[PDB]
Design a protein around this ligand. Sequence first.
Ligand code: MG
Ligand code: MG
Ligand code: MG
Ligand code: MG
Ligand code: ZN
Lengths: 84, 66, 184, 122
Amino acid sequence: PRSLKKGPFVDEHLAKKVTAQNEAGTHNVIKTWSRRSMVTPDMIGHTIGVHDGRKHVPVFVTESMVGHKLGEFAPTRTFKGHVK
Amino acid sequence: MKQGIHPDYRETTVVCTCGNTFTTRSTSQSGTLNADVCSKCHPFYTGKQKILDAGGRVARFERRYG
Amino acid sequence: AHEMPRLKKQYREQIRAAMQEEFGYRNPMLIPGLEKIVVNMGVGDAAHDSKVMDGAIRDITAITGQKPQVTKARKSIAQFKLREGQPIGCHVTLRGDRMWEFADRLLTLALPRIRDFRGLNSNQFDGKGNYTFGLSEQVMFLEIDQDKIDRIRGMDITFVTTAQTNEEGKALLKHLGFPFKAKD
Amino acid sequence: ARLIGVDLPRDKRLEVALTYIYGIGRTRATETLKATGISGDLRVHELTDDQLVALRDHIEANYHVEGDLRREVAADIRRKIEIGTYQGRRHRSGLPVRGQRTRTNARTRKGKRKAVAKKKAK
RNA sequence: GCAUGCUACAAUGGCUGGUACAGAGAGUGGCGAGCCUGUGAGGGUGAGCGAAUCUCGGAAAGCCGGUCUCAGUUCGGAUUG
RNA sequence: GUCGCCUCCUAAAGGGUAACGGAGGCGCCCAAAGGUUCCCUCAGCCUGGUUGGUAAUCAGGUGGUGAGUGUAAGUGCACAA
Ligand SMILES: [Mg+2]
Ligand SMILES: [Mg+2]
Ligand SMILES: [Mg+2]
Ligand SMILES: [Mg+2]
Ligand SMILES: [Zn+2]
């Protein structure tokens, strides 16, 4: 994982969008392609549409999400099983 | 009680290795009882564990970042 | 030997006074007390051999201190693979001094050394002031040996008390002292 | 029932009888011995109760062991399941979670090979 | 499902302390010694060397002492927290 | 297909009563499943309980015959047969 002394990586536009949402009301879905970013407490209770390759799947970030990346909650491959 | 069908059952000292000695009765053949832990010694209700859980998911975040 | 047990003395003095004060029975012989202790074990994997019953008899005899009643199968069942009249379980009834001292031994010694012991549920009463529970493993009764038991077995422990209602039965067994959690 | 919830096997050196405990490994057992000041090269059947309980106290005070650690690990896996991470989804699927390849073997997670009939050539 | 490999299933071995003997190569956004710090990966300082010079560097198997004693193990190191 | 024996119905409230009328059994079994004496009450249902499940064994509550009776059926049998 990322070095501790480098701090968490939030993609610096997701951060600004969630801060603006905090300032103007925590009610909107924030569309982003930043699977790369780190969930932080400052965005807790938001809903973020994380890109998964072809669609911005929405995730409602809760308290326990914080120690995870945004892309962990937007699966990229679909399997459904072999045969049927 | 019926004679000859019941086990040996006589006076029996128990020591709990925690400062507790008692004078119960059991079938401990030619011997007594050397317990490992007592009721008033067990960490269950004497209150010496208090595990509950570690549910601070965010608390971990500011622990390693704050 | 002639000596009225510690648990019996504690019951009489402390528990009878406590029940008389915090249930307000209008008659002196209405305070509940332990009537009997029943130690059962169904060893149903005895339909194919007898050695398991012999081991169960030895274990329960050592644990309690008296010969057990061995119950034969009331009816045969194919899917349990037991015939009619086969011995499939054994139980012991304890009253009086044996009851009191076995209860004292159990509470003070045995269930303390249950693996990762967390206490006993308070919601295992039959609904009439009697409380029955189960032990999944047997050698935890340190009154028995350790390196000669044929196989691990379990048992059921039932406290039958002269308690009319579940709440007063729970109060009696709490005052006698059980590990009672706050969980279902 | 020698230690917390496990019986140390007789005629085996203490330094590995300690590792026989869940939650205790080689280095954890070595630390435990150095803290308790107990030799590690003596068999378990020569163990006085005082030093045995001193070792038990040190282990219980410092280390999550046996049922506690097992419940903690199960709780962690269940938390991954209920949060729905990629690792949690792999856990529910019973499939490797740490980015292992799954095309060829992945066998220790996929179990035994349940071979299936396929298309037949001419 | 196949194919090429690696690590194994242990005692001609595992673990542990000590101690020998190479060759061929690479290096300036590089090779980095030494010292300090950390259980360690590493971090902080940081000489030297465009290199038969300085660094990578320790060779490992082996030998010697101790230990494990045939145990699905003090074998194996997959998986998982 | 049937032929002797047993139980029920037909059989019309004693007994008896036919049909190639309607249902089933028997050609045994048990040294106890006989004699006697004393003791006991079931099935089902509800609740609680290691393995254990609808149902093994245990506890409490309920429950009068719906269980049971070596073997068909009827008449009996819980005063227990
Ligand atoms: Mg060069
Ligand atoms: Mg007539
Ligand atoms: Mg007539
Ligand atoms: Mg005629
Ligand atoms: Zn104690």
